[PDB]
Design a protein around this ligand. Structure first.
Ligand SMILES: [Zn+2]
Lengths: 96, 87, 168, 171, 141
């Protein structure tokens, strides 16, 4: 249980830390993930759309930057739910 | 480490340029004639690069130097001029 | 070799680079320490090699005035290389615009002070690269300046470094 | 940043150029492939130091091609990017999601989430500028920027920057 | 991705180009200009000189047995293990039907084409609510 809760805390915290950063870009043709810093060099000659190396197709920004507050809220609500478990673990650490 | 070379004096190799590096130096001179690097011996109308190389070696003005190895890793240096084409 | 991770954050608080060690070895077999150069002295020393290679090419066909220099070395560099080094013109412009001292002898006297003081090389190279005059706002700007050096001694060297430099 | 280090670099040369005056020819070669070069390891390479007494001293002919190579040890001035240093760079181009500051070799860019929200951004500007008291992109455009990381990749080097710090951004 | 390579002479451009193949040297040349496009062709006959998948489907059939440099004690284990994965696929029933229609067609001395066409006919539907069992022999008949 201790390893499970610690892995939940660390995985959700790192997921929240990543998801607080903005999205990146999506190519609907090849259906693959892209990041903003990877898309820095994906600008075209005229800075209008984000050019694709394979599809030569514009890149559109994903929908996860507003999932920052959703991951935060899930973390907080789950933390509230497991707070009796955290208190019980504290009392176990008090005990033998 | 310790400069990995030897001075041109007290060289203990043979002073006789032998067959394999003979072949190599002929082939290289064929390459310089192949891509029109300047000749040094005068022409007599022949256009064969191997003939040009043979004549240049015979008159002994080939502008190349040769490096030999030893099992340690240190190397010697020689010029083709100070060798003597004897076989 | 085993991916050689060596994860180091780069910072001014003696958080060094992975290749830019303090101690190397040189081609002669002698120990080559790290060399870092400040903005002013870099802008001074580049012109030595610039005029040296210009007179070197002049001898090849034979066989401080920064307003002059930004166009002069542009002409010299487009003479031998192409016009692609507008980036280099920008870097020398940075070298000559925000350098703490325009002249050479003030920087040289600063170096003559520093060879006797024996300060930390990277620290004082960072100090020479930056252009500030008062130690406490320098400290609040850079936490390396906050933690590495006492503010009183920092100020007592900062004033005798800042009196020489041409104010902007 | 602007640093000095001994560097050894190997260069090759076509066998048709085996004239008497090839040392200076090699020197000219060294100038054009040293100048205007940015590497991942040492950032951008500016120019060369100690033009005289340069050391080349020997070359090897390739066995299969007449080309011969030559290693050159030299002193040079280079720019080395780093993380977390306040610099007073200049801005040339700007975007709506953020201005693109040209600090020497880099084009350091600040993404829309790293500008402070108390900066009074106005969208109706040509170019779009983020000004509050005096930090306006101009012909000078001197803006205090901190590169908290320069992201070197396959060789289109970009640096990330921030002005989320007191006196940073404003001049 | 568009998964596409198109070949065009970079110096004629009159159409999708009138090009030919020199298989005796394995190269391709735009017949108008006379320049190569690419080299080192891969043969298209030597593989047929070297050595029913459509009816056995995408999953591939494998009969297993014994050899010379093996042991009877474990090839009998193999002979009783060869049926441990016939229930994972319906292809055991597909090949049972294939075997039974083989029985039938060769019993009526029908040729290979008739056998494979009956295999095709079973593989066509092989499963509907219209099929619905019906003695499992009516469908093959
Ligand atoms: Zn053609």
């Amino acid at each position: 249980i201790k390893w499970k809760v610690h892995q939940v805390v660390q995985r959700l915290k790192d997921d929240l830390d990543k998801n607080s950063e903005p999205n990146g870009y999506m190519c609907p043709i090849c259906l693959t993930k892209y990041t903003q810093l990877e898309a820095v060099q994906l600008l075209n000659f005229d800075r209008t759309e984000f050019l694709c190396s394979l599809c030569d197709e514009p890149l559109v920004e994903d929908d996860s930057g507003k999932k920052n507050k959703e991951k935060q809220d899930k973390l907080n609500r789950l933390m509230d739910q497991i707070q009796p478990i955290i208190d019980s673990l504290k009392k176990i650490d008090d005990s033998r | 480490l310790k400069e990995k070379a030897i001075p041109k004096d007290q060289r203990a190799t043979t002073p006789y340029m032998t067959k394999y590096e003979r072949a190599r130096i002929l082939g290289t001179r064929a390459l310089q004639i192949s891509m029109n690097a300047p000749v040094f011996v005068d022409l007599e109308g022949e256009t064969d690069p191997l003939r040009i190389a043979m004549k240049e070696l015979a008159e002994k003005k080939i502008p190349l130097v040769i490096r030999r190895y030893l099992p340690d890793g240190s190397f010697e240096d020689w010029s083709v001029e100070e060798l003597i084409v004897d076989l | 070799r085993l991916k050689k991770v060596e994860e180091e954050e780069n910072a001014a608080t003696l958080q060094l680079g992975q290749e830019f060690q303090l101690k190397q070895i040189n081609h002669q077999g002698e120990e080559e320490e790290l060399i870092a150069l400040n903005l002013s002295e870099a802008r001074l020393v580049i012109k030595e090699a610039l005029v040296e290679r210009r007179r070197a090419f002049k001898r090849s066909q034979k066989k401080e005035t920064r307003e002059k220099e930004l166009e002069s070395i542009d002409v010299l560099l487009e003479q031998t290389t192409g016009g692609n080094n507008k980036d280099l013109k920008n870097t020398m412009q940075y070298l000559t615009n925000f350098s703490r001292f325009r002249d050479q002898e003030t920087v040289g006297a600063v170096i003559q002070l520093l060879k006797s003081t024996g300060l930390h090389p990277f620290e004082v190279a960072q100090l020479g690269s930056l252009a500030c005059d008062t130690a406490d706002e320098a400290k609040t700007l850079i936490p390396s300046l906050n933690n590495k050096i006492s503010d009183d001694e920092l100020e007592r060297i900062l004033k005798e470094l800042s009196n020489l430099e041409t104010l902007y | 940043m602007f640093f000095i280090k001994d560097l050894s670099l190997n260069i090759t040369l076509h066998p048709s150029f085996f004239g008497p005056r090839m040392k200076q020819y090699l020197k000219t070669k060294l100038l054009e492939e040293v100048e205007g070069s940015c590497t991942g390891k040492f950032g951008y390479i500016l120019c060369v130091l100690d033009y005289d007494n340069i050391d080349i001293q020997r070359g090897r002919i390739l066995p299969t091609d007449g080309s011969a190579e030559f290693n050159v040890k030299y002193r040079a001035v280079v720019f080395k990017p780093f993380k977390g240093e306040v610099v007073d760079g200049t801005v040339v181009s700007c975007s709506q999601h953020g201005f693109e500051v040209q600090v020497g070799p880099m084009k350091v860019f600040v993404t829309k989430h790293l500008m402070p929200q108390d900066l009074t951004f106005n969208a109706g500007s040509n170019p779009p500028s983020y000004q509050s008291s005096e930090d306006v992109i101009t012909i000078k455009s001197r803006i205090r920027v901190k590169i908290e990381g320069c992201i070197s990749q396959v060789s289109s080097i970009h640096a990330i920057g921030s002005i989320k710090e007191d006196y940073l951004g404003a001049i | 991705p568009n998964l596409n390579i198109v070949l065009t002479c970079p110096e004629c451009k009159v159409y999708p180009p009138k090009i030919v193949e020199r298989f005796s040297e394995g190269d391709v040349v735009c017949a108008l200009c006379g320049l190569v496009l690419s080299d080192k062709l891969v043969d298209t006959r030597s593989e047929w000189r070297t050595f029913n998948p459509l009816l056995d489907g995408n999953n591939l059939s494998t009969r297993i047995g014994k050899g010379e440099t093996t042991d009877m004690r474990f090839t009998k284990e193999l002979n009783k293990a060869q049926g441990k994965n016939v229930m994972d696929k319906k292809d055991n029933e597909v090949q049972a039907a294939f075997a039974k229609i083989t029985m039938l067609c060769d019993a009526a001395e029908l040729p290979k084409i008739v056998k494979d066409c009956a295999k095709e006919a079973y593989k066509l539907c092989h499963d509907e609510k219209t099929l619905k069992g019906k003695s499992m022999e009516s469908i093959m008949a």
